Design an enzyme around this catalytic site. Structure first.
Site, PDB file in Angstrom:
ATOM      1  N   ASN A 151       0.838  -1.118   0.101  1.00 50.95           N
ATOM      2  CA  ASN A 151      -0.126  -0.101  -0.013  1.00 50.95           C
ATOM      3  C   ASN A 151       0.872   1.417  -0.062  1.00 50.95           C
ATOM      4  OD1 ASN A 151      -1.791  -1.800   2.332  1.00 50.95           O
ATOM      5  ND2 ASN A 151      -2.427  -1.536   0.275  1.00 50.95           N
TER       6      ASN A 151
ATOM      7  N   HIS B 291       3.124   2.245   2.312  1.00 56.25           N
ATOM      8  CA  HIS B 291       3.230   2.743   3.575  1.00 56.25           C
ATOM      9  C   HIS B 291       4.646   1.987   4.152  1.00 56.25           C
ATOM     10  CE1 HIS B 291      -0.700   4.873   3.980  1.00 56.25           C
ATOM     11  NE2 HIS B 291      -0.944   3.758   3.391  1.00 56.25           N
TER      12      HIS B 291
ATOM     13  N   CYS C 270       5.994   7.460   9.570  1.00 54.11           N
ATOM     14  CA  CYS C 270       7.011   8.198   8.724  1.00 54.11           C
ATOM     15  C   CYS C 270       6.568   7.989   7.025  1.00 54.11           C
ATOM     16  CB  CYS C 270       8.320   7.450   8.898  1.00 54.11           C
ATOM     17  SG  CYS C 270       9.566   7.988   7.664  1.00 54.11           S
TER      18      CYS C 270
END
Ligand SMILES: Cc1nccn1-c1cccnc1
Ligand SMILES: Cc1nccn1-c1cccnc1
Lengths: 266, 266
Positions: free
Chosen positions: B187, B189, B224
């Site tokens: 995804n 991330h 982050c």
């Protein structure tokens, strides 16, 4: 995994993991490259070679095999949860060094989904000096290799043996200040060869990654990146989309790798 | 891998790979954490979850995110060893859910490690944390043990201890850490395991060379982003060595994680 019937090659099956896939839900080229390394290590272990794949004379003379070139061509990246079967074998290339080749197949269809070839050169692990293969060493591993040629890339004048030029400044794109962390190191505390592939790919624009699939990557290895070194990744479009790549130390600009990638529109 | 007889937990075996081990020729804590994530994903898939979300969660654009990860390892599996991991989920009322794991040596049947994680509900778009609604809680409860089953049962156990905020100046630091594409999940991330690696980057190499990591507790406060830069800070708090950790954005100093590690002399 297991050696084949004749004992001249090795096969292993892998189920692709959730964390091994990218945004297209298929294995990244770095996952593929880690799987190639793994099946190579399991082949060496299965025939009596040890944290390095070395012959008896190599241990005595403090010699190791080091990657000079990696060339990989993928037609289909396996999806998350899919089973990929990889076959690998070694071949002597006289006193120049050795070659390790791989064929990747979809386990359900039996279809070839990728192929790779790698050139390895002998070096003294203390002085880092490249050597040609001695007769004593060559005779200690030849009985584990096919005697007649067996090539993952047979075609005369194919992509795997093409000379790569040096990227000239200014680069079209760059990713600067790349540093290895402990997960980038192998059991001998050296930067894993696959990390360099990731660093090369870092300077490819995200828009290319989002609209294209990586078809071919050829990477030359000139010098190792130490654990405390910092790297700059440079890319220029040469064209399908083709790119020329260069990894160099952030400070003095010392070359560590050069390569090329070919990408097909999704 | 497979669900157990009662269908309330899931088991999977893994052969430790050559590139998954550190300088001791045993699996790194990041390899362990990737294996925990993988068996968790295979458990969710086996019972109909395909992110691991219920039907109401998809309708309301809600996802589960990690709030805390706690891992205790007694023995790290060696390269080529088979490790068996058992995992299960438990409802913690409206607060959220918990995913627990037990690691065993496949040959001896002996428990070699254990882990527990706390997950909270969050809206995918607004990033707003929330309590679990009764509609959602009723959609996953039949896949969890009804009576409590804890990987860390003990009254005063390390898994639920409050972690303080490291005060400047830190004893040690590793600055300018940035994620590469291999650090991202499907995804796009940053993978939760990357934060573990970044925490460990500020531990001195001498500690890593003479000690084994026994326990790591990590709190996750903020994500982050792919283009963010992180600073990893460590201060010794202590035969055993204990450290306090902090990850924060390199610019504004915004906290992303806090944690503690316990190390025992080799
Ligand atoms: C160790 C080594 N040196 C050259 C070739 N090889 C080899 C051959 C067969 C399987 N594994 C490694
Ligand atoms: C999807 C979900 N939300 C809370 C728990 N779970 C679950 C339950 C069983 C197996 N995998 C995930």
């Amino acid at each position: 995994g297991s050696l084949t019937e004749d004992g001249l090659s090795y096969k292993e099956k892998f189920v692709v993991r959730s964390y091994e896939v990218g945004s297209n839900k298929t294995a990244t080229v770095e996952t593929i490259a880690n799987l190639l390394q793994e099946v190579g290590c399991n082949h060496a272990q299965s025939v009596g070679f040890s944290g390095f794949a070395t012959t008896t004379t190599m241990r005595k003379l403090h010699l190791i095999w080091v990657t000079a070139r990696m060339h990989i061509e993928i037609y289909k990246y396996p999806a998350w949860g899919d089973v990929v079967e990889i076959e690998t074998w070694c071949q002597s290339e006289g006193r120049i060094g050795t070659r390790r080749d791989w064929i990747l197949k979809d386990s359900v269809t039996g279809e070839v989904t990728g192929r790779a070839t790698s050139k390895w050169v002998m070096m003294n692990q203390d002085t880092r000096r490249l050597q040609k293969v001695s007769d004593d060493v060559r005779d200690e591993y030849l009985v584990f290799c096919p005697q007649e040629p067996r090539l993952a890339f047979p075609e005369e004048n194919n992509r795997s043996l093409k000379k790569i030029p040096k990227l000239e400044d200014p680069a079209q794109y760059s990713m600067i200040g790349l540093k290895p962390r402990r997960a980038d190191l192998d059991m001998n505390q050296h930067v894993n060869n696959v990390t360099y592939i990731g660093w090369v790919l870092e300077s490819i624009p995200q828009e290319i990654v989002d609209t294209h699939e990586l078809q071919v990557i050829t990477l030359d290895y000139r010098r190792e990146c130490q654990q405390d070194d910092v790297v700059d990744s440079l890319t220029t479009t040469t064209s399908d989309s083709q790119f020329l790549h260069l990894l160099r130390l952030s400070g003095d600009g010392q070359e560590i790798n050069r390569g090329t990638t070919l990408w097909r529109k999704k």
